């Protein structure tokens, strides 16, 4: 019997492969200073930045913190600490993929806008999250994106909230404009694990 | 249906198969038909509905009145180069795809794992 001839299906497939994008990566120093005043037990957001796909960051932090003057050399130890978290934008806004041009069905609108927080009456107050992220306090009519504030609540719920004593901080994932920081208070960290603080409500 | 939407559905010709994520009881497979795979990539099956993903970038010209004309300003070179780079972006979206993983792989050098993008 005869032998079969090949099909062209593989060469046709190869003609349909798009070339890789040529990216033009570069290395540079993105140094920044930040200065603030704060009180013990709060989680203060001292560093905030936006990372692109295909970034690499190496971070060195220098700190000088001064305690306002004690009366006596009080006997108890007191740690300062800094913890860094990555938060993908798709964790804090459900339409982030659709904003970037994803469509659930062909010809869907896309064309979303970044969710907003408006400043409350009197502007954002001192010692709020808006203050600590460096949004100017006391200015009446401004608005800022909600995604940094949602990222703070999401970090809190996943890493700092006690899973059984404390209710989840609200984390709206939709497009809706907020007014004021009533969903975004500055959060307290939990006490160290000891005999009492590692106890549970039930057996 | 989730495998179909992410791996077999053509991102621009075919609507997403319904994927209810809640508790609700279904009756019958009306949301769950047996799906067809797409044909191999060739000259026709790798064609696209349009030359770019968006409307297509048109530099405005205005039109004379009848009253009731359209007035358009003089073109700055900055407006004109922005129109070109917007068209390049919409062509990259058509050619590369528009699922969030396809955007990352086409607009940047990055191969994201599937697991971290749901």
């Amino acid at each position: 019997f005869g032998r079969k001839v090949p099909s062209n299906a593989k060469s046709q497939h190869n003609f349909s492969v798009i070339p890789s994008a040529n990216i033009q990566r570069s290395v540079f120093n993105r140094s920044s200073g930040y200065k603030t005043t704060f009180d013990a037990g709060y989680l203060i957001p001292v560093f905030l930045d936006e990372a692109l796909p295909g970034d690499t960051f190496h971070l060195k932090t220098s700190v000088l913190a001064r305690l306002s003057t004690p009366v006596v050399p009080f006997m108890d130890n007191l740690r300062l600490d800094i913890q860094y978290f990555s938060v993908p934008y798709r964790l804090v806004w459900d339409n982030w993929q659709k904003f970037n041009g994803e469509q659930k069905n062909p010809g869907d609108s896309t064309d979303y806008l970044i969710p907003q927080i408006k400043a409350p009456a009197g502007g954002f107050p001192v010692g709020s999250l808006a203050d600590y992220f460096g949004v100017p306090t006391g200015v009446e009519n401004i608005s800022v994106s909600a995604l940094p504030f949602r990222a703070y609540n999401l970090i809190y719920n996943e890493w700092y909230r006690d899973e059984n004593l404390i209710n989840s901080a609200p984390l709206p994932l939709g497009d809706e404009e907020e007014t004021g920081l009533a969903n975004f208070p500055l959060r307290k960290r939990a006490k160290r694990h000891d005999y009492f603080t590692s106890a549970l409500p039930w057996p | 249906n989730l495998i179909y939407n992410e791996w077999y559905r053509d991102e621009n010709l075919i609507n997403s198969a319904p994927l209810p994520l809640g508790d609700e009881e279904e009756t019958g497979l009306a949301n769950f038909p047996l799906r067809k795979r797409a044909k191999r990539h060739d000259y026709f099956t790798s064609a696209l509905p349009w030359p770019q993903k968006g409307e297509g970038v048109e530099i405005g010209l205005g039109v004379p009145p009848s009253e009731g004309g359209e007035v358009v300003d003089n073109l700055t070179i900055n407006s004109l180069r922005q129109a070109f780079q917007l068209q390049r972006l919409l062509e990259r979206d058509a050619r590369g795809g528009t699922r969030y993983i396809e955007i990352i792989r086409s607009h940047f050098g990055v191969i994201s794992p599937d697991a971290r993008v749901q």
Binding site: V17 | W7, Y8, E11, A38, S46, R95, G97, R99, E102
Partner: peptide
């Protein structure tokens, strides 16, 4: 097996 035109479909 590479990045196809029109996005991924297997």
């Amino acid at each position: 097996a590479r990045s196809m035109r029109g996005g991924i479909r297997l």
